[PDB]
Every structure is written in C-alpha cells, then in structure tokens.
C-alpha cells in the first residue's frame, strides 16, 4: 500500500526552522556522490557498505560509506557490481571519507541502449498551481528516488531559489512518487523544527534504497509560499 499523501501537521515548516538554511541547500545544490560499476571494499556497522569512490572536481574524499536501513539490503548488495548515485555528508560521518545512505542499483542490465537517456517529468506546484514543469534524465532502468530527488532539488535551487543561505521563499514542500503499479510515497523537502540542522539524520531517510521504474515513475513537487 501506498504512503498516504500529507496532513496539514505532517508538513515541516520553514518558519518554524531557525537553523541555517544553508545546511539543507547545500546537499541539493550540484551536490552528489556518483560511482560505477563499482564493488563494496568494506563495512563499518551491519548494515552499511563501504566503497572506493573519489571525488573528481574538489577531491575531498577517496572512500565513501553508505548506511542501507538493515544488514538484508548490506548483504544483498556487498558484492555486486553497482553504480552509486546519492547526497553526502561531513558532519558526523564516522567510518578523506565521506557518508550517505542508499544510492545503490545493480549495474548489469540497468541501462537504455543506444547510450540513451530517460527523461523523467517533474510538475511542480505552488499553492495548488501546476506553475512549472521540468524534466530530469537518469541513464538507469531502475533508478533511486533520491537521485532523482537529487536532480529536481538542484534544479528548483537553481530555478526557484527553494533553499537560500537564510531561509526559503517556501513555508512547506514534499516531493511525491507516483509509480505506475499506483504506489505513491513522498519526501518532506524541508528541515525539522528548531535552530540546528542535522544533516545524517535528514538524508537517513533514503536508506530504504527506494527505487523506481524511470520510463513509467511520475513526479510531483508540492511547495506553498510564506505570506499566503
Ligand atoms: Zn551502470
């Protein structure tokens, strides 16, 4: 069965975060860990897998740990050959190492052919108004939510100042997957209440490994703005 969709009380408020806003932008904003073909080296805790991945641009990291939400997924996924996309953190990562969760899809028979993209399309709604669309692209047949939570965030950043080092435009938001076996689930897109920020404890919900049909998967973003 499906997540169902948000109450009023589910939604965290921006209003109500007196941290830094900065914090929640930063792990959205041309930011992410992206590996291939890939095979885990080690682990630290059960449930956790640990790779060979370096950074290209910035190099700051050389391994990266990633927390899946039981030892079954660590298990399952220790040693196959994987691509790895997802958002990392500095902040309590305790294995140049760097963390995240989830991230992981089998390699072998998980591409388009012609070295295809899949365009998958993001509606976006502001106060209940379909007021943009957008696509986004994944090479892979399955694909995590959070890579392509990743892409949309970057994207509306960039489009639609949705984090800003202050504060955000937007009081609520979630992102909603609607797969085509009728299963739907959605990611709160702003932090918890209060004056700090915890970055592994927010990105801790990716760990389910959470994937999607990247052909058939369809994407709503749901923001409501400040005043009204
Ligand atoms: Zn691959």
């Not at 792990?27 to 095979?39: I, M, N, P, Q």
């Not at 052919?113 to 509606?123: A, C, E, F, K």
Request: include cysteine; charge should be neutral.
């Amino acid at each position: 069965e499906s997540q169902p969709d948000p109450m009023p009380d589910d939604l965290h408020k921006s209003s109500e975060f007196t941290g830094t806003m900065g914090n929640m932008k930063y792990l959205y904003d041309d930011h992410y860990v992206s590996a291939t073909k890939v095979k885990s080296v080690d682990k630290f805790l059960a449930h956790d897998l640990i790779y060979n991945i370096s950074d290209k641009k910035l190099k700051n990291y050389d391994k990266v740990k990633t927390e899946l939400l039981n030892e079954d997924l660590a298990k399952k996924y220790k040693d196959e050959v994987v691509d790895v996309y997802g958002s990392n953190y500095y902040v309590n990562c305790y294995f140049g190492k760097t963390c995240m969760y989830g991230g992981i899809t089998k390699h072998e028979g998980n591409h388009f052919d012609n070295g295809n993209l899949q365009n998958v399309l993001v509606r976006v709604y502001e106060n209940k108004r379909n007021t943009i669309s957008f696509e986004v692209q994944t090479d892979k047949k399955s694909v995590t939510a959070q890579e392509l939570d990743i892409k949309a965030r970057n994207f509306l950043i960039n489009k639609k100042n949705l984090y800003e080092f202050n504060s955000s435009p937007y009081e609520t938001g979630y992102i909603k997957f609607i797969e085509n076996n009728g299963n739907t689930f959605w990611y709160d897109m702003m932090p918890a209440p209060g004056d700090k920020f915890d970055q592994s404890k927010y990105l801790m919900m990716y760990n389910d490994n959470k994937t999607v049909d990247s052909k058939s998967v369809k994407i709503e973003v749901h923001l409501t703005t400040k005043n009204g």
